[PDB]
């Protein structure tokens, strides 16, 4: 009669995360630690942080009442995913509790549907390493439009460390963007529902070498990138006939991107949802919830099914929790 409690482990990127949620929407514990600067070093960070986060998690909830252990199985970096996986089944063998392999990208979507009014949304995944448009169509979560080359989150980081800005350059670019107030000539690259930021980036830093003011470039880089994002979202929204639009990922913290997308949504008579700040970026809570979502609806996997999947495709899952 008591609700089942799951322990989630997030360790695909730079962020190490541990989460604890129940069968219901309640999140008992959630904490994530970042890494301030390399895949080998990032993996070492997970190996150091994960044991520490678990101590704090086991102080909130006693280890015996943990019924399920979920972990981000992928997609992500090789060495990073291995630490997460190893820690996940280490706990599974110790506590003598089941283990569940969880897709990272869907965990972002499902934690939004739990913390937002989204029922069947078209999700725009905008991360430091991801840029995809995911919707649930034909009994599977599918990517209708996604990025060629790199992600926009990666594009903002790579531009930041080029102009001598702190590593999480995303937020810092947004601040500088307000003071700019002059559009720079940049390439607008959209193909169908797919985008490319490689052409936009190289031209953006060339304009920096040209001597055009950095404030203007930050303003221009955002306007172009987010417009291209808004367009492919609009096309996919019409292609899937959904009634909602979700914005997940770390770049969801961008005020301008929210503004642009919410405006587009108000135009086509659809709703626009963004999760709480704690659940937008990488976190252990979303992995716990999706692991709980799959297992409660009847998915069991043995240890030999828990090997890492660095290139986990969205349509490789089997959605058993959607009515």
């Amino acid at each position: 009669m008591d609700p089942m409690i799951c322990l989630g482990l997030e360790g695909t990127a730079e962020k190490t995360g541990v989460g604890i949620v129940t069968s219901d929407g309640e999140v008992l514990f959630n904490k994530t630690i970042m890494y301030k600067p390399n895949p080998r070093e990032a993996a070492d960070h997970h190996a150091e942080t994960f044991p520490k986060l678990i101590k704090e998690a086991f102080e909130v909830v006693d280890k015996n009442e943990i019924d399920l252990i979920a972990f981000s199985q992928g997609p992500g970096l090789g060495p990073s995913l291995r630490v997460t996986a190893t820690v996940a089944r280490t706990l599974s063998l110790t506590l003598k509790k089941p283990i569940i392999g969880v897709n990272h990208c869907i965990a972002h979507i499902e934690i939004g549907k739990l913390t937002t009014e989204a029922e069947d949304p078209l999700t725009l995944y905008v991360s430091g390493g991801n840029t995809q448009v995911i919707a649930y169509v034909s009994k599977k979560y599918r990517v209708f439009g996604e990025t060629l080359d790199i992600a926009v989150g990666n594009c903002l980081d790579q531009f930041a460390r080029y102009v001598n800005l702190p590593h999480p350059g995303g937020p810092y670019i947004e601040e500088l963007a307000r003071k700019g107030k002059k559009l720079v000539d940049l390439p607008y690259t959209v193909k169908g529902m797919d985008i490319a930021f490689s052409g936009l980036l190289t031209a953006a830093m060339r304009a920096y070498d040209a001597g055009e003011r950095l404030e203007d470039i930050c303003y221009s880089l955002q306007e172009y990138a987010f417009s291209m994002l808004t367009e492919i979202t609009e096309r996919a929204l019409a292609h899937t006939n959904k009634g909602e639009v979700m914005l997940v990922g770390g770049v969801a913290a961008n005020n301008r991107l929210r503004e642009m997308l919410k405006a587009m949504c108000e135009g086509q008579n659809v709703d626009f949802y963004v999760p709480p700040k704690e659940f937008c970026g990488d976190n252990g809570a979303m992995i716990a919830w999706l692991g709980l979502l799959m297992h409660k609806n009847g998915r069991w996997m043995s240890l030999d099914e828990t090997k890492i999947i660095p290139n986990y495709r969205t349509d490789m899952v089997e959605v058993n929790w959607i009515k």
Binding site: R40, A43, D44, H46, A47, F50, P51, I54, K55, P79, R82, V83, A85, T86, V87, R89, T90, L91, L93, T94, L303, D304, T306, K307, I308
Partner: protein, 78 residues
């Protein structure tokens, strides 16, 4: 060539099994290896027999495996 043999002893035989079983699936999750490795369990200790081409190749696999084992042990305790 460059060869190495690493042994990691554990307090109990049961603890040895838990770490070994957890790490084992990562030992089979390697499609492309920088050096040849034998990952076996003898009693309370985990044996790690590595034979590589050069010193840099040995360092990569030792770092990887000892990382996994470190992560496994650190979890069982506390």
């Amino acid at each position: 060539r460059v060869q190495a043999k690493i042994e990691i002893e554990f307090p109990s035989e049961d603890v040895a099994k838990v770490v070994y079983e957890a790490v084992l699936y990562e030992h089979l999750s390697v499609p492309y290896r920088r050096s040849e490795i034998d990952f076996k369990l003898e009693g309370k200790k985990i044996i790690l027999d590595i034979k590589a081409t050069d010193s840099s190749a040995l360092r990569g696999t030792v770092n990887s495996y000892l990382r996994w084992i470190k992560a496994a042990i650190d979890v069982i305790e506390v």
